[PDB]
């Protein structure tokens, strides 16, 4: 879990965070300042301790409408010439009404904890996986503290879906994070 | 390291290997079948055990020259709508003359072992890093043999490039694996 936190910061957040505000700048110029509230000039990393990583947010919850991509950023990265970073902008709805707009993705290494929890040889329990997901969640911040960009640029949304999955909506969790801030 | 093998397989290779031949085929249709050879239709993953992951292949070896991109694949992945996957095709020179064409990139997560080795608080030596690199490699090899999509789509190029000197040719290492 220590290794995943470092890996994620070094493999991704280190590369995308620096150039993110420049990309919001141009997005607002061309899309009539959709991302106005400084609260929505941040990257929102969904960190379900669930360790579930679905592909489509509109499918998990229909109240997270996809509205637009950021502008693409091309980085020369590890033997890829012009690796392409696309980031998705979402509108969050409440009772039919647009209650928010933000840059939403999941922390992908979390699926590693899930996959590894299920391995027959070196597997472990849902409760041990919950513990490793927390060590991950905690460790990312201590690395995160030291880097001047970071805090202004992205925010972790940490959450545990009930044993069902119902009685819980992810739109409500996202809305309560932007509103609190 | 156990964690990096699973993370690299689960979070990247799982996603990109199934579409690769379909992408090589469209590429071949628009680039006078540049990837004609059998050696030319694998994703080759550079696995330097020194965990040196530089960003440019023409800079590391002048006999590896960028030719073109595969067509992109668009994948809905962990809240990114149409996340963009690209892969780079390179001509491999021998005696100043084109000898091979292939899809080439580094195993990015090795950068983690490198940064950890450079961390003053980690207390993680170069000897300890090499042992993790080898364990990463091995655990990745064990995952890939156990998956059908690896057989004709994926090849690990694992090398121990010495600290100093020029006795190691990445180009020739790549041309070795390409012909086998
Ligand atoms: O290693 C990669 N990804 C990951 C590795 C992890 F270990 C992990 F836990 C999560 C990921 C992840 O991508 O989410 C990776 C490598 C190359 C490219 N790529 C090259 C051109 N276009 C895209 N993209 N991703
Ligand atoms: O987690 C990622 N990457 C990695 C994570 C690792 F733990 C690692 F060791 C290596 C990587 C890597 O990408 O090389 C990641 C996540 C999202 C995006 N992305 C791309 C376009 N929109 C979003 N790209 N990468």
Coordinates of C-alpha atoms and ligand atoms in Angstrom, one line a residue:
Chain A
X1 CA 0.0 0.0 0.0
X2 CA 3.0 2.3 0.7
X3 CA 4.3 1.3 -2.8
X4 CA 1.0 2.1 -4.6
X5 CA 0.8 5.7 -3.0
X6 CA 4.4 6.5 -4.2
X7 CA 3.8 4.8 -7.5
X8 CA 0.5 6.8 -8.2
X9 CA 2.0 10.1 -7.1
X10 CA 5.2 9.5 -9.2
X11 CA 3.4 7.7 -12.2
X12 CA 0.6 10.3 -12.6
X13 CA -0.2 13.2 -10.1
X14 CA 3.5 14.5 -10.4
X15 CA 3.0 14.6 -14.2
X16 CA -0.6 16.0 -14.5
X17 CA -1.0 18.5 -11.6
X18 CA 1.7 21.0 -12.7
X19 CA 0.1 21.9 -16.1
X20 CA -3.5 21.6 -14.9
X21 CA -4.4 25.3 -14.2
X22 CA -3.1 26.3 -17.7
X23 CA -5.6 23.7 -19.1
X24 CA -8.5 25.1 -17.0
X25 CA -7.5 28.6 -18.2
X26 CA -8.1 27.7 -21.9
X27 CA -11.2 25.6 -21.1
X28 CA -13.0 28.6 -19.4
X29 CA -12.0 30.9 -22.4
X30 CA -13.6 28.5 -24.9
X31 CA -16.6 27.2 -22.7
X32 CA -17.9 30.5 -21.1
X33 CA -16.2 30.0 -17.7
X34 CA -18.0 26.7 -16.8
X35 CA -15.3 26.2 -14.2
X36 CA -15.7 29.5 -12.3
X37 CA -15.8 28.7 -8.6
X38 CA -12.1 28.1 -7.6
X39 CA -13.6 25.0 -5.8
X40 CA -14.0 23.5 -9.4
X41 CA -10.5 24.6 -10.6
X42 CA -9.3 21.4 -8.7
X43 CA -8.9 17.7 -9.7
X44 CA -11.2 15.4 -7.6
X45 CA -9.7 11.9 -7.0
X46 CA -12.5 9.5 -6.0
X47 CA -10.9 7.2 -3.4
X48 CA -13.5 4.5 -2.6
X49 CA -12.1 2.2 0.2
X50 CA -14.6 -0.2 -1.4
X51 CA -11.6 -0.7 -3.8
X52 CA -14.3 -0.8 -6.6
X53 CA -13.2 1.2 -9.7
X54 CA -16.0 1.4 -12.3
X55 CA -15.3 2.9 -15.8
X56 CA -18.4 5.1 -16.3
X57 CA -19.7 7.5 -13.5
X58 CA -23.0 8.1 -15.3
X59 CA -23.6 4.3 -15.1
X60 CA -22.8 4.0 -11.3
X61 CA -25.1 7.1 -10.7
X62 CA -27.2 8.8 -13.5
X63 CA -27.0 12.2 -11.7
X64 CA -23.2 12.6 -12.7
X65 CA -23.8 13.9 -16.3
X66 CA -20.6 14.1 -18.5
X67 CA -20.5 17.6 -20.1
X68 CA -17.0 18.1 -21.7
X69 CA -13.3 17.0 -21.7
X70 CA -10.5 19.4 -20.6
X71 CA -8.1 20.2 -23.4
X72 CA -5.7 17.3 -23.9
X73 CA -2.1 17.6 -22.6
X74 CA 0.7 15.8 -24.5
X75 CA 3.8 14.7 -22.4
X76 CA 6.9 12.8 -23.7
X77 CA 6.8 10.0 -21.1
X78 CA 8.9 6.7 -21.0
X79 CA 9.4 5.8 -24.7
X80 CA 5.9 7.2 -25.7
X81 CA 6.3 10.3 -27.8
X82 CA 3.3 12.6 -26.9
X83 CA 1.4 10.4 -24.3
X84 CA -2.1 11.9 -24.2
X85 CA -3.8 13.0 -20.9
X86 CA -7.6 13.6 -21.5
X87 CA -9.6 14.7 -18.3
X88 CA -13.4 14.6 -18.0
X89 CA -15.6 17.5 -16.7
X90 CA -18.9 16.4 -15.0
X91 CA -22.1 18.2 -14.0
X92 CA -23.6 16.8 -10.7
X93 CA -27.5 16.9 -10.7
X94 CA -29.9 17.2 -7.7
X95 CA -33.7 16.5 -8.3
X96 CA -33.1 17.4 -12.0
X97 CA -31.1 20.6 -11.3
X98 CA -27.4 21.3 -12.1
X99 CA -26.0 21.5 -8.5
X100 CA -22.3 21.5 -9.5
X101 CA -19.5 21.0 -12.2
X102 CA -16.1 19.4 -11.4
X103 CA -13.1 17.3 -12.8
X104 CA -13.7 13.8 -11.5
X105 CA -11.6 10.5 -11.8
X106 CA -10.8 7.4 -9.6
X107 CA -7.4 6.6 -8.2
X108 CA -6.7 3.5 -10.4
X109 CA -4.1 1.7 -8.3
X110 CA -7.0 0.9 -5.8
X111 CA -8.1 -1.9 -8.3
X112 CA -4.6 -3.5 -7.5
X113 CA -5.7 -3.9 -3.8
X114 CA -8.9 -5.6 -5.0
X115 CA -7.2 -7.9 -7.6
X116 CA -4.5 -8.8 -5.0
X117 CA -7.1 -9.4 -2.2
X118 CA -8.6 -12.1 -4.5
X119 CA -5.3 -13.9 -5.4
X120 CA -5.4 -17.6 -4.2
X121 CA -1.7 -17.6 -3.1
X122 CA -1.1 -14.2 -1.4
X123 CA -4.8 -13.2 -1.0
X124 CA -6.3 -11.4 2.1
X125 CA -9.7 -10.5 3.6
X126 CA -12.1 -7.5 2.9
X127 CA -11.1 -6.1 6.3
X128 CA -7.2 -6.4 5.7
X129 CA -7.9 -4.7 2.2
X130 CA -9.8 -1.9 4.0
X131 CA -6.7 -1.4 6.2
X132 CA -4.3 -1.3 3.1
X133 CA -6.7 1.1 1.3
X134 CA -6.4 3.5 4.4
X135 CA -2.5 3.2 4.5
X136 CA -2.5 4.1 0.8
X137 CA -5.0 7.0 1.5
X138 CA -2.9 8.3 4.4
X139 CA 0.6 7.9 2.7
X140 CA -0.5 9.9 -0.5
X141 CA -0.9 13.0 1.8
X142 CA 2.5 12.9 3.6
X143 CA 4.2 12.7 0.0
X144 CA 1.5 15.3 -1.1
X145 CA 2.3 17.8 1.8
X146 CA 5.9 18.5 0.6
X147 CA 4.9 19.5 -3.1
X148 CA 3.9 23.2 -3.4
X149 CA 1.4 22.6 -6.3
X150 CA -0.7 19.6 -4.8
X151 CA -3.2 21.2 -2.3
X152 CA -4.5 24.0 -4.6
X153 CA -4.6 21.6 -7.5
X154 CA -6.4 18.3 -6.3
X155 CA -8.4 16.9 -3.5
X156 CA -9.1 13.3 -2.3
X157 CA -12.7 12.2 -1.9
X158 CA -12.5 9.2 0.6
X159 CA -15.7 7.0 1.2
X160 CA -17.0 3.5 2.0
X161 CA -20.2 2.4 0.2
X162 CA -22.6 0.4 2.5
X163 CA -22.6 -3.4 2.2
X164 CA -25.6 -3.0 -0.2
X165 CA -24.5 -0.1 -2.5
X166 CA -28.0 1.4 -2.1
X167 CA -28.9 3.9 0.7
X168 CA -25.8 5.7 -0.8
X169 CA -25.4 7.9 -4.0
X170 CA -22.0 9.1 -5.2
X171 CA -23.5 12.4 -6.6
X172 CA -24.5 13.2 -3.0
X173 CA -21.0 12.4 -1.7
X174 CA -19.4 14.6 -4.5
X175 CA -21.9 17.5 -3.9
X176 CA -21.2 17.5 -0.1
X177 CA -17.4 17.7 -0.8
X178 CA -17.6 20.8 -3.1
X179 CA -20.3 22.4 -0.9
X180 CA -18.3 21.9 2.4
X181 CA -15.1 23.4 0.9
Chain B
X1 CA 7.1 -4.8 -6.1
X2 CA 4.7 -7.7 -5.8
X3 CA 2.3 -4.6 -5.8
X4 CA 4.0 -3.0 -8.9
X5 CA 3.6 -6.3 -11.0
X6 CA -0.1 -6.5 -10.2
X7 CA -0.6 -2.7 -10.6
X8 CA 1.2 -2.7 -14.0
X9 CA -0.8 -5.8 -15.2
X10 CA -4.2 -4.8 -13.7
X11 CA -4.0 -1.0 -14.5
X12 CA -2.3 -1.0 -17.9
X13 CA -1.5 -4.3 -19.8
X14 CA -5.0 -5.9 -19.0
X15 CA -6.5 -2.9 -20.9
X16 CA -4.2 -2.4 -23.9
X17 CA -3.3 -6.0 -25.1
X18 CA -6.8 -7.1 -26.5
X19 CA -7.1 -4.2 -29.0
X20 CA -3.4 -4.2 -30.1
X21 CA -3.6 -6.5 -33.3
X22 CA -6.7 -4.6 -34.5
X23 CA -4.6 -1.3 -34.2
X24 CA -1.5 -2.9 -35.9
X25 CA -3.7 -4.0 -38.7
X26 CA -5.2 -0.4 -39.3
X27 CA -1.6 0.9 -38.9
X28 CA -0.3 -1.6 -41.6
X29 CA -3.2 -0.6 -43.9
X30 CA -2.1 3.1 -43.8
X31 CA 1.7 2.7 -43.5
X32 CA 2.6 0.2 -46.4
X33 CA 2.6 -2.8 -43.9
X34 CA 5.6 -1.3 -42.0
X35 CA 4.9 -4.0 -39.2
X36 CA 5.0 -6.9 -41.7
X37 CA 7.4 -9.2 -39.8
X38 CA 6.1 -11.5 -37.0
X39 CA 8.7 -9.9 -34.7
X40 CA 6.9 -6.6 -35.5
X41 CA 3.4 -7.3 -34.0
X42 CA 4.2 -7.4 -30.2
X43 CA 4.1 -4.6 -27.6
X44 CA 7.8 -4.7 -26.4
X45 CA 8.2 -3.4 -22.8
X46 CA 11.7 -2.1 -22.0
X47 CA 12.5 -3.4 -18.5
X48 CA 15.8 -1.9 -17.4
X49 CA 16.6 -3.4 -13.9
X50 CA 18.7 -0.3 -13.0
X51 CA 15.2 1.4 -13.0
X52 CA 16.5 4.2 -15.3
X53 CA 13.3 5.3 -17.1
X54 CA 14.1 8.2 -19.4
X55 CA 11.4 9.9 -21.5
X56 CA 13.1 9.8 -25.0
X57 CA 14.4 6.7 -26.9
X58 CA 16.2 8.7 -29.7
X59 CA 18.2 10.4 -26.9
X60 CA 19.2 7.1 -25.1
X61 CA 20.2 5.3 -28.4
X62 CA 20.7 7.0 -31.8
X63 CA 19.9 3.7 -33.6
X64 CA 16.3 3.8 -32.2
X65 CA 14.4 6.4 -34.3
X66 CA 10.7 7.3 -33.9
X67 CA 8.7 6.5 -37.1
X68 CA 5.0 7.0 -36.2
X69 CA 2.1 6.3 -33.7
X70 CA -0.3 3.4 -33.7
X71 CA -3.9 4.7 -34.1
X72 CA -5.1 5.6 -30.6
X73 CA -7.5 3.5 -28.5
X74 CA -10.3 5.3 -26.6
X75 CA -11.3 3.6 -23.3
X76 CA -13.8 4.5 -20.6
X77 CA -11.5 3.9 -17.6
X78 CA -11.9 4.9 -13.9
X79 CA -14.0 8.1 -14.5
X80 CA -12.0 9.2 -17.6
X81 CA -14.4 9.3 -20.6
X82 CA -12.5 8.1 -23.7
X83 CA -9.1 7.9 -21.9
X84 CA -6.5 8.0 -24.8
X85 CA -3.9 5.2 -25.2
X86 CA -1.1 5.7 -27.7
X87 CA 1.9 3.5 -28.7
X88 CA 5.0 4.5 -30.6
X89 CA 6.6 2.6 -33.6
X90 CA 10.4 2.8 -33.9
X91 CA 12.8 1.7 -36.7
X92 CA 15.9 -0.1 -35.1
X93 CA 19.1 0.7 -37.0
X94 CA 22.1 -1.6 -37.5
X95 CA 25.3 0.0 -39.1
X96 CA 23.3 3.2 -39.9
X97 CA 20.6 1.2 -41.9
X98 CA 17.1 0.2 -40.9
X99 CA 17.0 -3.5 -39.6
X100 CA 13.7 -3.7 -37.6
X101 CA 10.4 -2.0 -36.8
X102 CA 8.5 -2.5 -33.5
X103 CA 6.3 -1.0 -30.8
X104 CA 8.5 0.1 -27.9
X105 CA 7.9 1.7 -24.4
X106 CA 9.3 1.5 -20.8
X107 CA 7.5 -0.1 -17.9
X108 CA 6.7 3.3 -16.1
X109 CA 6.2 1.9 -12.6
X110 CA 10.0 1.1 -12.3
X111 CA 10.3 4.9 -11.8
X112 CA 8.8 4.2 -8.3
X113 CA 11.7 1.9 -7.3
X114 CA 14.1 4.5 -8.6
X115 CA 12.6 7.5 -6.6
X116 CA 12.4 5.2 -3.5
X117 CA 16.1 4.4 -4.0
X118 CA 16.8 8.2 -4.1
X119 CA 14.6 8.8 -0.9
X120 CA 16.8 9.7 2.1
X121 CA 14.1 8.5 4.6
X122 CA 13.3 5.2 2.7
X123 CA 16.9 3.8 3.4
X124 CA 16.5 1.9 0.1
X125 CA 19.9 1.0 -1.5
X126 CA 20.8 0.3 -5.2
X127 CA 21.4 -3.4 -4.2
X128 CA 17.8 -3.6 -2.6
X129 CA 16.3 -1.8 -5.7
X130 CA 17.8 -4.4 -8.2
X131 CA 16.3 -7.3 -6.1
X132 CA 12.9 -5.5 -6.2
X133 CA 13.3 -4.9 -10.0
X134 CA 14.0 -8.6 -10.5
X135 CA 11.0 -9.6 -8.2
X136 CA 8.7 -7.1 -10.1
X137 CA 9.9 -8.6 -13.5
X138 CA 9.5 -12.2 -12.2
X139 CA 6.0 -11.7 -10.6
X140 CA 5.0 -9.9 -13.9
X141 CA 6.3 -12.9 -15.9
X142 CA 4.2 -15.2 -13.7
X143 CA 1.0 -13.1 -14.2
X144 CA 1.6 -12.9 -18.0
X145 CA 2.2 -16.7 -18.7
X146 CA -1.2 -17.3 -17.0
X147 CA -3.2 -15.1 -19.4
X148 CA -3.8 -16.0 -23.1
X149 CA -3.7 -12.4 -24.4
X150 CA 0.1 -12.3 -23.5
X151 CA 1.3 -15.1 -25.9
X152 CA 1.4 -13.1 -29.2
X153 CA 0.8 -9.5 -27.9
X154 CA 3.5 -8.9 -25.2
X155 CA 7.3 -9.3 -24.7
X156 CA 9.4 -8.2 -21.7
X157 CA 13.0 -6.9 -22.6
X158 CA 14.8 -7.2 -19.3
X159 CA 18.4 -6.0 -19.2
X160 CA 21.2 -5.1 -16.6
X161 CA 22.9 -2.0 -18.3
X162 CA 26.2 -1.5 -16.4
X163 CA 26.6 1.8 -14.4
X164 CA 29.2 3.4 -16.8
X165 CA 30.8 2.5 -20.2
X166 CA 29.1 2.0 -23.7
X167 CA 29.5 -1.8 -24.1
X168 CA 25.6 -2.2 -23.9
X169 CA 23.6 -1.5 -27.1
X170 CA 19.8 -1.1 -26.4
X171 CA 19.2 -1.2 -30.2
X172 CA 20.9 -4.7 -30.5
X173 CA 19.1 -6.0 -27.3
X174 CA 15.8 -5.0 -29.1
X175 CA 17.0 -6.5 -32.4
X176 CA 17.8 -9.8 -30.4
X177 CA 14.2 -10.1 -29.0
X178 CA 12.6 -9.0 -32.4
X179 CA 14.3 -12.0 -34.3
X180 CA 13.6 -14.7 -31.6
Ligands
LIG1 O1 1.5 2.0 -16.4 C1 0.5 2.6 -16.8 N1 -0.6 2.8 -16.1 C2 -0.8 2.4 -14.8 C3 0.1 1.6 -14.1 C4 -0.1 1.2 -12.8 F1 0.8 0.5 -12.1 C5 -1.3 1.6 -12.2 F2 -1.5 1.2 -10.9 C6 -2.2 2.4 -12.8 C7 -2.0 2.8 -14.1 C8 -3.0 3.6 -14.8 O2 -2.7 4.0 -16.1 O3 -4.0 3.9 -14.3 C9 0.5 3.2 -18.1 C10 1.6 3.0 -19.0 C11 1.5 3.6 -20.3 C12 0.3 4.3 -20.6 N2 0.2 4.9 -21.8 C13 1.1 5.0 -22.8 C14 0.5 5.7 -23.8 N3 -0.7 6.0 -23.4 C15 -0.9 5.5 -22.2 N4 -0.6 4.4 -19.7 N5 -0.5 3.9 -18.5
LIG2 O1 -2.3 5.9 -12.3 C1 -1.9 6.2 -13.4 N1 -0.7 5.9 -13.9 C2 0.3 5.2 -13.3 C3 0.1 4.7 -12.0 C4 1.1 4.0 -11.4 F1 1.0 3.6 -10.1 C5 2.3 3.8 -12.1 F2 3.3 3.1 -11.4 C6 2.5 4.2 -13.3 C7 1.5 4.9 -14.0 C8 1.6 5.4 -15.3 O2 0.6 6.0 -16.0 O3 2.7 5.3 -15.9 C9 -2.7 7.0 -14.3 C10 -4.0 7.4 -13.9 C11 -4.7 8.2 -14.8 C12 -4.1 8.5 -16.0 N2 -4.8 9.3 -17.0 C13 -4.4 9.4 -18.3 C14 -5.4 10.2 -18.8 N3 -6.3 10.5 -17.9 C15 -5.9 10.0 -16.8 N4 -2.9 8.1 -16.3 N5 -2.2 7.4 -15.4

